[PDB]
Every structure is written in C-alpha cells, then in structure tokens.
Amino acid sequence: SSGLVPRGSHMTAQTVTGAVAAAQLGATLPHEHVIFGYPGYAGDVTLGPFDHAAALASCTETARALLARGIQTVVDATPNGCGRNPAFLREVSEATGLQILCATGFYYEGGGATTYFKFRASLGDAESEIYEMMRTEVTEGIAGTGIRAGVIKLASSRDAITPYEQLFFRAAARVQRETGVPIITHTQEGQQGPQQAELLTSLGADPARIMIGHMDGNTDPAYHRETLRHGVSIAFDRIGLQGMVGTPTDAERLSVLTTLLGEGYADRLLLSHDSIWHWLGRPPAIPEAALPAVKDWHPLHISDDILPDLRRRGITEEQVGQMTVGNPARLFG
Amino acid sequence: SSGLVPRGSHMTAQTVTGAVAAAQLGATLPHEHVIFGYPGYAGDVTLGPFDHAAALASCTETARALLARGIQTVVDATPNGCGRNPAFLREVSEATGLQILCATGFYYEGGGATTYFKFRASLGDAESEIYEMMRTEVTEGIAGTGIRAGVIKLASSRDAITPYEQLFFRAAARVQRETGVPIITHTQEGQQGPQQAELLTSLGADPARIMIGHMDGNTDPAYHRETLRHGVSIAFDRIGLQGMVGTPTDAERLSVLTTLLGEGYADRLLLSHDSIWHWLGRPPAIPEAALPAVKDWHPLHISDDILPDLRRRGITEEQVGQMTVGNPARLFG
Ligand SMILES: [Co+2]
Ligand SMILES: [Co+2]
Ligand SMILES: [Co+2]
Ligand SMILES: [Co+2]
C-alpha cells in the first residue's frame, strides 16, 4: 500500500449484487448511466413509458460489449431523482456478470429533483434528513430492497456550490467519515472543482475516497492542478460528448490529460463517458447539427479510441492501467 | 342557459371513475390535492415510502367528511410530476362515492419537475410533445389506465409567464379548442392572473372553461377586476393557508371577496383550499411559529367557517350556491 491509502472504516465495494473485493473490480468506468431520465420524465409516462424488455435487452447488450473490452465494473452515477433504479441494475448485472455500483444523492440545484429538499430545508433540518438518507442507503439498502449504494453522488452549480447543494456536501462528508464510502461528483460547466475539493476535505472527508467529476469540462490545466492540490482524484468523465453545451472536443480533453500525465498525476486521474445506455421518457430527438457532438458518446469509446490514442502519444501501459484499474481499486474498493 | 355558456365541443365532466353529467357534480371544491409531493419526494423513498393502506384510510375518511358537508365533487389539481396518481384517486372515489376529476399538466418553472421538458425544448418541438400528452390524457387516458384527465392544469411564475411555461399554455389552448376540456391555473405570489387570462383567450381558449387560480394571493381588488375583464372565472382557492409565504389572512381574502361579490361577480368566483390530504415523501415537520398558518388549511374549512361568515356578512344563499354549485357545473360539466 504505497501512496495515499484511504480507509479508516470499510475495505470493499458494495455493488448491486453484493460485496466485492478491491481485487475483483478489474478495469472500471467510474461514471456512466445504465438508464437515465431528466427529472420530469415520469410525468411524461403516458407517451414515454419504460419498455422493460427493450431496456433489459439493450442494457445487457451494452454490458456484454464492455465485458468484451475487459471492463468488469461500472459505477452508475445516476442521482436519486434522475431515474435511479437499483432493482433494474441488479437484473442487468445478474444477466451478464458485469459488476455495477449504484449511487445515493440528488443532482445540482438547476438540474435535479430539487423542489422537495429545498422545501424541507425551509421548514427544518434538511441536512440531517439527507444525511439519514445517504447513511441508510449506503449501510442498509435503497427502498427496502437490500441493494446498497456503493458511492455517494454530489453535484454543484456553475457559479457557486449553492446553499442547497451544500446541505448535501455536509451530509455526504459525515457519511464518508462514518463509513468510508467513496464520493463522486458532478461539476457544472467546468467550474467549482477546486471549491468542491476544498469543501469536502475541510469537512473531514477522505481525499483518497473522493473523485471530483466532469473536470474535462475545463481546458486550463491550471484549474485541474489547483484541484489535484487537495489529494483528491479527478475524472475526465464525459469523454466523447463534444461541443454539446459548454463541452470541449476530445482533442482538447486529450491535450490537458497528456499535460497532466507528463506531470506525474496518473495515480489521480480517471476516465469515463457519462453515457446513457437507455433514456427514460420519450426517445430524445436530436437535431441534425448535433449529431457530431454525440457520435462518440457511448461506453466503448474509451476502450476503442482513447486508450490507443494515448498509448500512441507516449502514455505507457502502466499509466493506462493505473487510471483504469489501479485508481478505481483504491477509490471504490 | 343564461350568461356565458362554454361548449363548442364536449358537454360532460370526465372523472376518475368515468363520465358524469353536469347535473351530477353537486357542490364542488375546484382545487384540492388528494395526495401531493414536491418534485423530488420519490428520491426520498427509502425513508419516506408511500403507506398505501394508511393513505387510502386517511383519504377516504376526508372524502367522507366532505360528502357529509354535501360536497359531491373534488377537482384534484395535482401536476404530473407532483405525485399525480389516477389509480389511487379512483380507489378513493370507488370506496366513497365522492367524484374526483384529475388533471394533466406540469407545475410552474421554479416548482415542478421542470428539467425534462426544458431539455426536450432545447433539442426540439416541446410544445407539440406537451400538446400530444395533454390530448391523449384528456381523450384516451393516463399511463395506459383508461382514466382520463378532467382538467388541464397550468401554472406560471411570479415575475412573468416564462418561455418554458408558455409552451404549456400554448399546448393547453389548442387542446381546449379541440376538446372543450376545462383549464385551471396556478398563479405565483398573486401575480400574472391578468397576463394569464389575456394569453389564454388571445390564443382562442374558451374563457367560459378557464379558471384562473390562487387569485386570493393578491389583496388589491383592482387586480381581480382586470382579470375578470377577460370573461374567465377566478378562484380564491388557498383559503385557510394564512401568512405562509406571501399568503394573506382569510380576513384579507374575505374583504376582497365581499367587495367583488357586491359588484356582481358571483357567477365568476370559486372557492377552494388547495389542501393536501396526505403528503408524499416524509411527513412534513412544521415549525412552531407556523402552526397558525396551517391551522385552517384543510378541506372542511370552507363548509364550516367560510360559507357561514359570508352569509352573516350579507352574502345570499343564491350567491353561495352560484359559487359552489352553479359555477362548477358550467366550468367542469
Ligand atoms: Co453530471
Ligand atoms: Co452523469
Ligand atoms: Co398551486
Ligand atoms: Co394546488
């Protein structure tokens, strides 16, 4: 155990099919979505119902493609009000042998099912209620199913980590101290990564069990270094989603990643696509002038295009294996 | 048929148990919520699960209290992402004989499950998708159950009827023209009632099938008169919720109502409480200094306190019956 070792509580990952040893995780995609729906999809159920059979078949087929690439584990980052479904994920994992960790947490203020806790917080101690929720889901189970969350998912807004969002960061830090559970995050439009890192550590969370996400959203390597200064891991986890919204191109992403890799940060970098394998609600109807932005936005893009492009640029096999197997065994294992 | 008669399409109300004649509605509470949860409650399902047996017993008991007061119909105004459940409402109606109409629509921008259609609208024709949804739910059924919505529910924000909200007002107006379905609304903090009235009529919706809501939220009688100028009905429908948020006291509400009644607007005024009979999510924990605001916030308050206070102030039995039986038979029947 060389470097920054986590622990001070638990030593194994909790997947939707149960406990798994750090050594069993194999290469991991740390931020993906088996199913995902923007909050409000369930109100469009009349015309956009879930086709369980089509979903299970499509999701298992994508799981099989991943296992063929040697990926043995996926961390499903779906927030509580964005379609999270542990029972479903379990079916997918049982059908294929792909290991899946699910999350506990709500999305950022402007993008999650926010109204509920914003309201409870105006009438009482919402931080304590969010903490009780994260702890029960991480230690006992989600919705009386016995399936436990393997990560706590946090998210902040673009201009600041809002008071609403901080209720979750405080509750999350506490659960992290008490269970050692991993924490992954969402940053909005390439901002707040350093503030996030600072707030979670200042609150006592283990920086070795923290992964600040969507860091590929910023193209100034200075921004990632300031974040890395905290000891936390960062993830370029929207690889393949290019130009959509404020998103950069993978060429801008690989430029910043190779700079950081050449500075010795391999032990702190992770890669994922933030893909959605099956959308909840009605099928998205993507405009013509947007097809390029999502063309490479699927879960086989890193294995097929990215790792080879890195290797051809000078990145070693040991660096690649540290990002894809080394880092997750320690952060989630 | 004297006065402003609706029609030009359909002539009866659609309840969760089926079609009902205008003459069968009896006295009506036009804006209530059998069950309600702020968007995000379903993500708090681990610690705040729905207890169907406790819910059915509590809801049927409240339904029985209403029928004892002679109320035979309730219009459930719950938006699509706020706990709407037609199957449940049907159980309550079947168990008791209370007639219940349910709605189709999403809540105002800052309070509903907004993310989903805000997103679809950035990628395509969300107005058409919302229109298809309202029309199928009003004419065929909600979620493949065969239970149809009897009203379209619309809502706007405080400072303006937002572009997002206008997608729904446009779709609603179209469905209104094609089916004659009634439209009820939500106004936020006593603003936009006139703008609402203006936009729906300018769009061709039938002002005789429009009820602008939460109009008791404003205490300047000039505001209601400008709204009434459009031919639409208005509702003082949060009666009993006092001082909570920007809400006035019932004494301020009755002062504006008696002024309007003394100006001959009885044919255009309706009364309801906007109560919630059973909350979804964890039980609300209401702070001590807030007990007065919700004390009279339940569905028997109008029948027991309000109608008598009006009658003692000079309002006649015919005026009362026009607001509670006359008006709804025409607007929803
Ligand atoms: Co995200
Ligand atoms: Co994500
Ligand atoms: Co309302
Ligand atoms: Co309401």
XYZ file of C-alpha atoms and ligand atoms in Angstrom:
670
model
C 0.000 0.000 0.000
C 2.081 2.885 -1.375
C 0.852 6.460 -1.753
C -2.366 7.886 -0.295
C -4.336 4.949 1.123
C -7.972 5.552 2.116
C -9.587 3.521 4.876
C -10.321 4.202 8.488
C -13.646 2.343 8.198
C -14.504 -0.115 5.331
C -12.314 -2.108 2.850
C -14.557 -3.377 -0.031
C -17.005 -2.158 -2.703
C -20.756 -2.641 -2.383
C -22.309 -3.488 -5.800
C -25.933 -4.040 -6.653
C -25.333 -7.780 -6.415
C -23.381 -7.508 -3.176
C -19.974 -7.019 -1.659
C -16.919 -7.280 -3.911
C -13.189 -7.303 -3.089
C -10.977 -4.455 -4.276
C -9.123 -7.075 -6.354
C -12.289 -8.124 -8.208
C -13.147 -4.739 -9.712
C -10.865 -5.079 -12.714
C -10.831 -2.155 -15.209
C -13.607 0.294 -14.308
C -15.735 3.014 -15.921
C -16.293 5.317 -12.961
C -19.119 7.470 -14.175
C -21.820 6.036 -16.520
C -25.623 5.801 -16.526
C -27.329 2.438 -17.295
C -30.710 4.231 -17.502
C -31.262 7.992 -17.113
C -34.124 10.431 -17.319
C -34.123 14.159 -16.636
C -36.411 14.982 -13.674
C -39.902 15.199 -15.042
C -39.649 12.149 -17.327
C -42.028 10.222 -15.084
C -44.706 12.836 -15.742
C -44.423 12.018 -19.482
C -45.218 8.391 -18.761
C -48.384 8.263 -20.945
C -46.382 8.768 -24.130
C -42.952 7.792 -22.832
C -43.359 4.625 -20.752
C -40.463 2.382 -19.792
C -40.249 -0.720 -22.030
C -38.610 -3.041 -19.545
C -37.946 -5.806 -22.066
C -36.341 -3.471 -24.628
C -34.358 -1.764 -21.834
C -33.052 -5.031 -20.343
C -32.014 -6.308 -23.797
C -30.291 -3.079 -24.841
C -28.561 -2.658 -21.436
C -27.348 -6.249 -21.284
C -26.025 -5.957 -24.851
C -24.010 -2.872 -23.906
C -22.835 -4.676 -20.720
C -21.644 -7.551 -22.906
C -19.742 -5.189 -25.172
C -17.968 -3.750 -22.076
C -17.001 -7.122 -20.687
C -15.576 -7.971 -24.126
C -13.230 -4.970 -23.726
C -12.132 -6.342 -20.332
C -14.159 -3.766 -18.349
C -15.530 -5.630 -15.340
C -17.126 -2.826 -13.418
C -19.217 0.215 -13.947
C -20.075 2.904 -11.461
C -23.595 4.100 -12.180
C -23.652 7.835 -11.149
C -27.425 8.342 -11.522
C -28.934 10.604 -8.857
C -31.983 9.662 -6.836
C -34.474 11.724 -8.889
C -32.872 11.016 -12.313
C -34.162 7.506 -12.913
C -32.080 5.632 -10.348
C -33.329 2.049 -10.214
C -31.271 -0.495 -8.176
C -33.545 -3.443 -8.957
C -33.107 -2.874 -12.700
C -29.301 -2.506 -12.458
C -29.267 -5.741 -10.478
C -31.130 -7.553 -13.290
C -28.525 -6.253 -15.771
C -25.653 -7.387 -13.513
C -27.172 -10.735 -12.793
C -27.860 -11.355 -16.500
C -24.259 -10.550 -17.556
C -21.732 -10.727 -14.720
C -20.801 -7.026 -15.146
C -20.419 -5.528 -11.673
C -22.325 -2.318 -11.073
C -22.145 0.075 -8.161
C -25.070 2.463 -7.779
C -25.197 5.879 -6.079
C -27.071 7.923 -3.426
C -27.508 11.664 -3.812
C -29.537 14.341 -5.604
C -28.397 16.414 -8.619
C -27.282 20.001 -8.761
C -29.798 22.723 -7.994
C -30.699 23.655 -11.562
C -30.835 20.039 -12.786
C -32.154 17.596 -10.172
C -35.492 16.914 -8.461
C -34.708 19.946 -6.257
C -38.057 21.228 -5.061
C -38.541 18.567 -2.374
C -35.417 19.129 -0.221
C -35.330 22.873 -0.943
C -38.773 22.979 0.699
C -37.993 20.675 3.649
C -34.931 22.854 4.280
C -37.079 25.981 4.602
C -39.138 24.171 7.270
C -36.486 22.242 9.202
C -33.156 20.338 9.306
C -32.837 19.087 5.733
C -29.089 18.455 6.149
C -29.885 15.808 8.846
C -32.604 14.267 6.691
C -30.257 13.994 3.702
C -27.608 12.501 5.960
C -30.026 9.900 7.309
C -30.931 9.001 3.738
C -27.359 8.612 2.476
C -26.395 6.572 5.519
C -29.341 4.103 5.283
C -28.864 3.639 1.571
C -25.088 3.100 1.931
C -25.327 0.842 5.014
C -28.705 -0.940 4.807
C -30.334 -0.519 1.427
C -32.340 1.536 -1.039
C -36.174 1.427 -0.978
C -36.365 -1.707 1.172
C -34.569 -3.816 -1.441
C -31.390 -4.626 0.397
C -29.372 -3.203 -2.539
C -26.920 -0.698 -1.124
C -25.372 2.350 -2.748
C -21.622 1.977 -3.392
C -20.907 5.674 -3.826
C -22.423 8.947 -2.719
C -23.074 11.221 -5.683
C -22.704 15.024 -5.177
C -23.190 17.879 -7.622
C -22.756 21.624 -7.699
C -23.870 24.556 -9.920
C -21.732 26.686 -12.217
C -21.381 29.959 -10.312
C -21.042 28.527 -6.825
C -21.755 25.498 -4.655
C -25.205 26.730 -3.582
C -26.581 26.698 -0.042
C -28.981 23.997 -1.223
C -26.092 21.932 -2.643
C -24.018 22.430 0.471
C -26.680 20.592 2.525
C -25.662 17.507 0.588
C -21.926 18.098 0.727
C -22.145 18.390 4.519
C -24.250 15.258 4.903
C -22.040 13.379 2.443
C -18.822 14.315 4.343
C -20.329 12.957 7.547
C -21.384 9.686 5.952
C -17.907 9.441 4.400
C -16.278 9.754 7.847
C -18.553 7.132 9.338
C -18.499 4.507 6.614
C -15.522 5.247 4.376
C -17.954 5.144 1.397
C -16.495 6.719 -1.829
C -17.797 10.112 -3.055
C -18.025 11.034 -6.727
C -19.018 14.410 -8.047
C -20.520 16.460 -10.854
C -19.165 19.930 -11.679
C -21.148 22.221 -13.930
C -19.573 23.824 -16.961
C -16.011 23.299 -15.809
C -16.291 25.289 -12.584
C -16.105 24.684 -8.816
C -13.772 21.643 -8.855
C -11.279 23.316 -6.526
C -14.072 24.676 -4.274
C -15.515 21.216 -4.130
C -12.208 19.578 -3.182
C -11.611 22.292 -0.603
C -15.068 21.983 0.991
C -15.124 18.196 1.197
C -11.619 17.898 2.745
C -12.110 20.884 5.033
C -15.125 18.925 6.225
C -13.050 15.848 7.048
C -13.932 13.638 4.090
C -11.145 11.265 2.998
C -9.431 12.794 -0.075
C -8.418 9.264 -1.100
C -12.136 8.353 -1.441
C -13.098 11.468 -3.415
C -13.361 11.776 -7.167
C -14.136 15.228 -8.487
C -16.018 14.825 -11.764
C -16.572 16.474 -15.133
C -13.124 18.005 -14.818
C -12.670 17.621 -18.598
C -15.156 20.475 -18.778
C -12.325 22.929 -18.227
C -9.430 23.208 -20.674
C -6.988 25.203 -18.493
C -4.570 22.703 -16.927
C -4.055 25.200 -14.069
C -7.617 24.504 -12.928
C -7.019 20.725 -12.615
C -3.690 21.253 -10.738
C -5.327 23.509 -8.164
C -7.923 20.790 -7.698
C -5.333 17.974 -7.517
C -3.534 20.024 -4.884
C -6.155 18.645 -2.407
C -5.210 14.999 -2.767
C -8.457 14.034 -4.461
C -8.709 12.213 -7.761
C -10.293 13.972 -10.748
C -12.197 12.454 -13.657
C -12.332 13.392 -17.353
C -15.650 11.523 -17.412
C -17.704 12.974 -20.331
C -15.273 11.718 -22.991
C -16.995 11.527 -26.374
C -19.592 14.256 -25.657
C -18.101 17.084 -27.728
C -19.222 20.650 -28.143
C -22.610 19.789 -26.645
C -23.348 22.725 -24.301
C -20.030 24.085 -22.990
C -18.295 20.775 -23.602
C -14.838 20.688 -25.214
C -13.699 18.335 -28.011
C -11.873 15.140 -27.095
C -8.795 16.737 -28.703
C -8.916 19.490 -26.095
C -9.529 16.871 -23.417
C -6.516 14.705 -24.501
C -4.271 17.792 -24.666
C -4.995 18.619 -20.948
C -4.821 14.918 -19.967
C -1.418 14.358 -21.589
C -0.067 17.510 -19.889
C -1.198 16.221 -16.514
C 0.084 12.742 -17.261
C 3.502 14.221 -18.160
C 3.482 15.910 -14.730
C 3.046 12.620 -12.926
C -0.635 12.700 -11.946
C -1.543 9.202 -13.263
C -2.410 7.984 -9.769
C -5.077 10.654 -9.560
C -6.727 10.626 -12.999
C -9.751 8.592 -14.115
C -11.674 8.299 -17.434
C -15.369 7.682 -18.244
C -18.001 8.809 -20.810
C -21.042 9.856 -18.746
C -23.025 7.890 -21.339
C -26.687 6.926 -21.078
C -27.410 3.407 -22.267
C -31.208 3.771 -22.392
C -33.063 7.022 -21.935
C -36.169 7.277 -19.715
C -39.111 9.401 -21.045
C -39.677 9.611 -24.854
C -36.679 8.843 -27.087
C -34.540 12.017 -27.405
C -34.978 13.686 -30.791
C -31.507 15.042 -31.525
C -31.222 17.857 -34.158
C -29.103 17.350 -37.282
C -26.444 19.934 -36.332
C -25.855 17.962 -33.138
C -25.050 14.502 -34.450
C -21.260 15.167 -34.322
C -21.447 16.044 -30.620
C -22.861 12.674 -29.642
C -21.271 10.422 -32.219
C -18.538 9.215 -29.879
C -20.756 9.411 -26.761
C -21.151 5.790 -25.856
C -19.297 3.376 -23.444
C -16.921 1.674 -25.910
C -15.246 4.947 -26.975
C -12.562 4.980 -24.287
C -11.535 1.340 -24.835
C -11.562 1.660 -28.633
C -10.408 5.171 -29.401
C -8.960 6.800 -26.323
C -6.576 4.335 -24.727
C -4.912 3.737 -28.094
C -4.564 7.418 -28.883
C -2.882 7.894 -25.501
C -0.519 4.923 -25.979
C 0.426 6.318 -29.440
C 1.185 9.681 -27.777
C 3.685 8.275 -25.300
C 1.481 7.236 -22.438
C 2.645 3.902 -21.081
C 0.832 0.729 -20.413
C 1.484 1.270 -16.702
C -0.060 4.731 -16.790
C -3.144 3.402 -18.545
C -3.548 0.524 -16.154
C -3.152 2.879 -13.184
C -6.026 5.105 -14.397
C -8.306 2.209 -15.353
C -7.570 -0.486 -12.751
C -5.204 0.993 -10.119
C -7.167 4.072 -9.306
C -10.614 2.501 -9.038
C -9.496 -0.490 -6.951
C -8.307 2.019 -4.341
C -11.087 4.656 -4.648
C -14.005 2.216 -4.784
C -12.517 -0.960 -3.440
C -78.518 28.632 -20.496
C -78.114 32.291 -19.498
C -74.814 34.171 -19.434
C -71.516 32.954 -20.905
C -72.039 29.326 -21.944
C -68.955 27.268 -22.854
C -69.196 24.413 -25.331
C -68.333 24.070 -28.963
C -67.062 20.517 -28.361
C -67.938 18.412 -25.231
C -70.802 18.630 -22.648
C -69.852 16.492 -19.570
C -67.111 16.046 -16.943
C -64.634 13.173 -17.069
C -63.902 11.859 -13.528
C -61.521 9.137 -12.486
C -64.455 6.731 -12.370
C -65.860 7.899 -15.692
C -68.145 10.365 -17.379
C -70.519 12.420 -15.230
C -73.358 14.789 -16.187
C -73.084 18.487 -15.378
C -76.126 17.977 -13.120
C -74.380 15.288 -11.050
C -71.439 17.387 -9.862
C -73.259 18.946 -6.930
C -71.254 21.391 -4.746
C -67.589 21.283 -5.782
C -64.134 22.058 -4.369
C -62.306 23.102 -7.523
C -58.718 22.953 -6.424
C -57.556 20.336 -3.846
C -54.864 17.644 -3.672
C -55.782 14.095 -2.503
C -52.057 13.210 -2.349
C -49.170 15.599 -3.092
C -45.405 15.538 -3.024
C -42.964 18.239 -4.077
C -40.820 17.039 -7.018
C -38.010 15.027 -5.546
C -40.131 13.159 -2.977
C -39.711 9.928 -4.923
C -35.951 10.163 -4.430
C -36.561 10.118 -0.639
C -38.393 6.826 -0.962
C -36.025 4.855 1.343
C -37.067 6.875 4.383
C -40.332 8.290 3.060
C -42.202 5.458 1.325
C -45.891 5.612 0.486
C -48.019 3.675 3.014
C -50.877 2.785 0.715
C -53.108 1.424 3.474
C -52.666 4.478 5.725
C -53.128 6.778 2.700
C -56.325 5.065 1.496
C -57.815 5.151 5.018
C -56.929 8.794 5.666
C -58.074 9.910 2.173
C -61.366 8.030 2.336
C -62.027 9.481 5.802
C -61.530 13.011 4.477
C -63.725 12.128 1.446
C -66.435 11.001 3.862
C -66.210 14.241 5.805
C -66.704 16.173 2.515
C -69.713 14.169 1.436
C -71.210 14.827 4.886
C -70.996 18.568 4.096
C -72.856 17.935 0.818
C -69.709 18.308 -1.334
C -70.031 15.713 -4.086
C -67.054 16.547 -6.219
C -63.456 17.476 -5.918
C -61.128 18.655 -8.627
C -57.674 17.286 -7.898
C -55.198 19.920 -9.297
C -52.024 17.837 -8.832
C -49.499 18.251 -11.652
C -47.916 15.330 -13.450
C -44.608 15.420 -11.521
C -46.146 16.299 -8.107
C -47.480 12.897 -7.108
C -50.377 12.625 -9.550
C -51.818 9.124 -9.275
C -55.121 8.390 -11.125
C -55.339 4.774 -9.964
C -55.148 5.863 -6.317
C -57.763 8.631 -6.740
C -60.005 6.051 -8.384
C -59.702 3.754 -5.336
C -60.697 6.694 -3.100
C -63.684 7.525 -5.340
C -64.790 3.960 -5.661
C -64.544 3.417 -1.887
C -66.667 6.505 -1.056
C -68.785 7.760 -3.953
C -67.015 11.168 -3.937
C -66.443 12.185 -7.556
C -62.914 13.248 -8.402
C -61.577 14.852 -11.544
C -57.821 14.652 -12.053
C -55.530 16.935 -14.082
C -52.875 16.946 -16.853
C -50.057 19.475 -16.829
C -46.698 20.301 -15.239
C -46.065 22.899 -12.493
C -44.520 26.315 -12.755
C -40.865 26.595 -13.695
C -39.437 27.050 -10.207
C -41.681 24.397 -8.621
C -42.410 21.446 -10.924
C -40.428 18.558 -12.430
C -39.093 21.108 -14.956
C -35.782 19.724 -16.145
C -37.284 17.157 -18.531
C -39.333 19.425 -20.848
C -36.893 22.337 -20.509
C -34.308 19.972 -22.021
C -36.528 18.480 -24.752
C -37.404 22.062 -25.715
C -33.738 22.931 -26.267
C -33.496 19.956 -28.660
C -36.832 20.083 -30.487
C -40.589 20.862 -30.526
C -41.519 20.504 -26.861
C -44.760 22.472 -27.354
C -46.018 19.708 -29.739
C -44.920 16.981 -27.337
C -46.744 18.632 -24.428
C -49.802 19.048 -26.624
C -49.764 15.381 -27.611
C -49.545 14.473 -23.937
C -52.429 16.674 -22.778
C -54.617 15.491 -25.636
C -54.036 11.731 -25.040
C -54.559 12.075 -21.322
C -57.756 14.137 -21.770
C -59.189 11.992 -24.598
C -57.832 8.453 -24.085
C -56.204 8.028 -20.705
C -53.249 8.474 -18.383
C -50.452 5.850 -18.287
C -52.466 3.179 -20.102
C -55.106 3.064 -17.360
C -58.092 4.382 -19.228
C -58.549 7.069 -16.529
C -58.782 10.410 -18.281
C -57.861 13.863 -17.032
C -60.891 16.132 -16.498
C -58.963 19.395 -16.464
C -55.705 20.712 -17.836
C -53.599 22.268 -15.093
C -51.378 25.288 -15.992
C -49.032 27.333 -13.830
C -46.876 30.410 -14.147
C -44.016 32.074 -12.191
C -44.120 35.302 -10.203
C -42.289 37.774 -12.439
C -43.623 36.584 -15.775
C -45.177 33.645 -17.600
C -41.820 32.168 -18.659
C -40.946 30.878 -22.123
C -40.891 27.402 -20.586
C -44.367 27.922 -19.077
C -45.709 29.352 -22.302
C -45.010 26.019 -24.058
C -47.740 24.595 -21.860
C -50.152 27.492 -22.201
C -49.939 27.184 -25.992
C -50.451 23.425 -25.979
C -53.255 23.739 -23.428
C -55.118 26.374 -25.534
C -55.010 24.045 -28.525
C -56.324 21.077 -26.571
C -59.030 23.352 -25.136
C -60.175 24.317 -28.656
C -60.263 20.713 -29.789
C -61.937 19.072 -26.818
C -63.591 21.817 -24.782
C -61.724 20.431 -21.717
C -61.652 22.891 -18.723
C -58.384 24.672 -17.796
C -57.464 25.576 -14.229
C -54.435 27.560 -13.218
C -51.847 28.371 -10.576
C -50.533 31.928 -10.157
C -47.446 32.544 -8.073
C -47.449 35.081 -5.281
C -50.507 36.933 -6.509
C -49.103 37.902 -9.905
C -49.787 37.197 -13.598
C -53.545 36.486 -13.342
C -54.393 39.144 -15.921
C -51.488 38.080 -18.190
C -52.703 34.540 -17.930
C -56.299 35.416 -18.835
C -55.048 37.568 -21.694
C -52.726 34.891 -23.115
C -55.197 32.020 -22.937
C -58.078 33.963 -24.581
C -55.822 35.626 -27.136
C -54.906 32.055 -28.009
C -58.528 31.060 -28.598
C -59.217 29.132 -25.401
C -62.832 29.323 -24.184
C -62.986 31.903 -21.348
C -66.043 30.053 -20.012
C -63.848 26.951 -19.439
C -60.991 28.826 -17.753
C -60.447 29.258 -14.044
C -57.532 31.442 -13.050
C -56.265 30.227 -9.679
C -54.630 31.424 -6.474
C -56.210 34.811 -7.073
C -56.660 35.206 -3.294
C -52.903 35.700 -3.307
C -53.420 39.340 -4.209
C -55.310 41.710 -1.915
C -55.900 44.589 -4.377
C -59.425 44.175 -5.775
C -58.268 46.083 -8.887
C -56.104 43.094 -9.815
C -59.065 40.651 -9.770
C -61.279 43.058 -11.816
C -58.660 43.391 -14.538
C -58.534 39.607 -14.630
C -62.343 39.210 -14.626
C -62.434 41.660 -17.518
C -61.478 38.652 -19.742
C -64.585 36.605 -19.053
C -62.728 33.909 -17.149
C -63.618 32.721 -13.675
C -61.154 33.280 -10.822
C -60.622 31.185 -7.704
C -59.760 32.163 -4.119
C -58.510 28.585 -3.746
C -55.901 28.597 -0.911
C -58.451 29.540 1.767
C -57.158 28.598 5.215
C -53.435 28.835 4.327
C -52.600 32.131 6.044
C -49.385 34.080 6.142
C -47.476 31.048 4.868
C -45.070 32.505 2.271
C -46.704 35.579 0.704
C -50.171 34.330 1.579
C -52.755 36.715 3.059
C -55.058 36.002 6.032
C -58.574 34.745 5.373
C -59.761 38.130 6.694
C -57.948 39.833 3.829
C -59.325 37.213 1.453
C -62.972 37.706 2.634
C -62.604 41.502 2.401
C -61.656 41.263 -1.350
C -64.273 38.531 -1.960
C -67.130 40.530 -0.421
C -66.121 43.594 -2.480
C -66.255 41.549 -5.663
C -69.489 39.888 -4.619
C -71.035 43.339 -4.004
C -70.033 44.236 -7.583
C -71.953 41.322 -9.029
C -69.182 38.847 -9.872
C -70.766 35.780 -8.176
C -71.057 33.949 -11.494
C -67.300 34.147 -11.869
C -65.953 33.381 -8.384
C -64.992 29.981 -6.955
C -63.619 28.824 -3.552
C -61.231 26.001 -2.543
C -58.416 25.354 -0.005
C -55.525 23.912 -2.046
C -55.243 21.400 0.805
C -53.148 18.234 0.782
C -54.891 15.261 2.346
C -51.802 13.031 2.578
C -48.279 14.172 1.868
C -45.869 12.082 -0.247
C -42.210 11.848 0.975
C -41.502 12.012 4.761
C -44.170 13.650 6.944
C -43.659 17.455 6.860
C -42.096 18.745 10.075
C -43.770 22.124 10.537
C -42.020 24.669 12.860
C -43.824 26.008 15.936
C -44.140 29.592 14.630
C -46.008 28.196 11.631
C -48.851 26.290 13.252
C -51.252 29.279 12.913
C -50.674 29.435 9.152
C -51.883 25.897 8.572
C -54.465 25.535 11.300
C -57.399 26.212 8.991
C -55.728 24.577 5.956
C -57.863 21.534 5.435
C -60.941 20.725 3.209
C -63.752 21.281 5.741
C -62.799 24.929 6.407
C -64.890 26.459 3.629
C -68.047 24.490 4.501
C -67.670 25.091 8.245
C -66.181 28.541 8.612
C -66.304 30.400 5.333
C -69.782 29.985 3.903
C -71.295 30.981 7.247
C -69.089 34.025 7.648
C -70.162 35.152 4.174
C -73.880 34.557 4.858
C -73.532 36.566 8.122
C -71.938 39.400 6.101
C -74.834 39.761 3.685
C -73.982 37.243 1.028
C -77.111 35.400 -0.030
C -77.879 31.776 -0.307
C -78.151 32.236 -4.075
C -74.701 33.794 -4.277
C -73.205 30.942 -2.281
C -74.898 28.297 -4.353
C -73.749 30.010 -7.557
C -70.078 29.884 -6.466
C -70.251 26.319 -5.137
C -72.685 24.542 -7.481
C -73.578 26.943 -10.337
C -70.102 27.849 -11.380
C -68.571 24.374 -11.356
C -71.467 22.682 -13.174
C -70.796 25.070 -16.065
C -66.958 25.220 -15.920
C -66.383 21.490 -15.428
C -69.650 19.981 -16.501
Co -23.238 15.200 -14.318
Co -23.594 11.667 -15.071
Co -50.513 25.984 -6.903
Co -52.557 23.199 -5.785
